[PDB]
Design a binder for this molecule. Structure first.
Ligand SMILES: Nc1ncnc2c1ncn2[C@@H]1O[C@H](COP(=O)(O)OP(=O)(O)OP(=O)(O)O)[C@@H](O)[C@H]1O
Ligand SMILES: Nc1ncnc2c1ncn2[C@@H]1O[C@H](COP(=O)(O)O)[C@@H](O)[C@H]1O
Ligand SMILES: [Mg+2]
Ligand SMILES: [Mg+2]
Length: 298
């Protein structure tokens, strides 16, 4: 398992997120390394879920391919017969480095990002449900009366956010990134979410909502799908089997972890080591999401 990548300065670091380490490959290219870290209640666990980052990378690769005729994406085309390692400095093929990178890394074009978190919600839950119960709105948008918890919205909706996160209205998104650009990302995001939500539902997973990020290629005026796509870290995954309108749903991937944290008053606490049984049960859910959605065997 890979918790924290250690590349000994071979590439400069651009960022470390909750789960991913981002390196600069060259002036036009980044390397996104998904680690096996996991977060709950906005804090990272001390220990890892082995191979989570491989599974999530491969799931993202599946979705990029699934959506290849719908949207351009940031992946660098790896030539036939080659691997990402052929596009990286030779030293990163040495075992001490290759073992940290293989199967969990994506080579991506640097794009100009549209600085907006493009959340699409298919189902009313989370902060959207809380706001709705209080004022009948979601990100300020008036909703029909009588929706029940976890109910499907009449149509999936664009509900933007700004990173720290702040739920904002569509009008505020247009202030931030321009009216026409906000309109284009909203329309595209809803199309992409709906297609993938329908596919996943037929496989038995409900993707209640998802967070996309987009770039813009200004030379072609094309919106580019970037960042994390339709993983349980970027989305709310629910078990289809146990879906019941009018109540909360278990987290597909994190409910075992959340239950254990809650039982021990560890929600939100730093430095927490998960017990082996929690690690194992959580890992098995990632493998099942990967196998069910991609049709591949792990
Ligand atoms: N193709 C792209 N080109 C340039 N930047 C990108 C591209 N795709 C995503 N990014 C940016 O790269 C970074 C991805 O890092 P990552 O999402 O793993 O961590 P984070 O956003 O800092 O924290 P978090 O774990 O909460 O997402 C983000 O700053 C994201 O907006
Ligand atoms: N941009 C990329 N970064 C890292 N791995 C990639 C990338 N593109 C494709 N791959 C991997 O290369 C293999 C062949 O994919 P493809 O190049 O699309 O034919 C797959 O197993 C992918 O996981
Ligand atoms: Mg991010
Ligand atoms: Mg992803």
């Amino acid at each position: 398992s890979i918790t924290k990548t250690e590349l000994d300065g071979i590439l400069p670091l651009v960022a470390r997120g909750k789960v991913r380490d981002i390196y600069e490959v060259d002036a036009g290219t980044l390397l996104f390394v998904a680690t096996d870290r996991i977060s709950a209640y906005d804090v990272i666990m001390e220990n890892s879920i082995p191979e989570k980052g491989i599974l999530l990378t491969k799931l993202s690769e599946f979705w990029f391919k699934f959506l290849s005729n719908d949207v351009r994406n940031h992946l660098v085309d790896i030539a036939p017969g080659k691997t990402i390692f052929d596009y990286l400095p030779a030293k990163l093929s040495e075992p001490k480095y290759k073992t940290q990178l293989e199967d969990r890394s994506l080579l991506v074009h640097k794009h100009k990002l549209i600085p907006l978190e493009v959340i699409v919600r298919g189902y009313i839950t989370g902060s959207a449900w809380k706001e709705y119960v209080k004022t009948g709105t979601v990100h300020g948008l008036k909703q029909p009366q009588g929706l029940k918890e976890s109910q499907e919205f009449p149509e999936p909706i664009f509900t933007p956010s700004t990173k720290a996160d702040e739920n904002i209205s569509p009008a505020q998104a247009a202030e931030l990134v321009g009216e026409d650009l906000s309109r284009r990302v909203a329309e595209l995001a809803v199309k992409l979410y709906s297609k993938c939500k329908d596919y996943a539902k037929e496989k038995g997973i409900i993707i209640a909502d998802t967070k996309f990020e987009f770039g813009i290629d200004e030379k072609t005026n094309e919106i580019i799908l970037v960042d994390e796509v339709l993983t349980p870290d970027s989305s709310r995954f629910w078990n289809g089997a146990s879906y019941k309108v009018g109540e909360s749903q278990d987290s597909y991937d994190k409910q075992f972890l959340r239950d254990w944290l809650t039982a021990n008053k560890l929600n939100g606490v730093n430095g927490v080591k998960m017990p082996q049984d929690i690690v194992d049960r959580t890992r098995a859910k990632y493998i099942e999401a990967y196998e069910t959605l991609t049709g591949s065997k792990w």
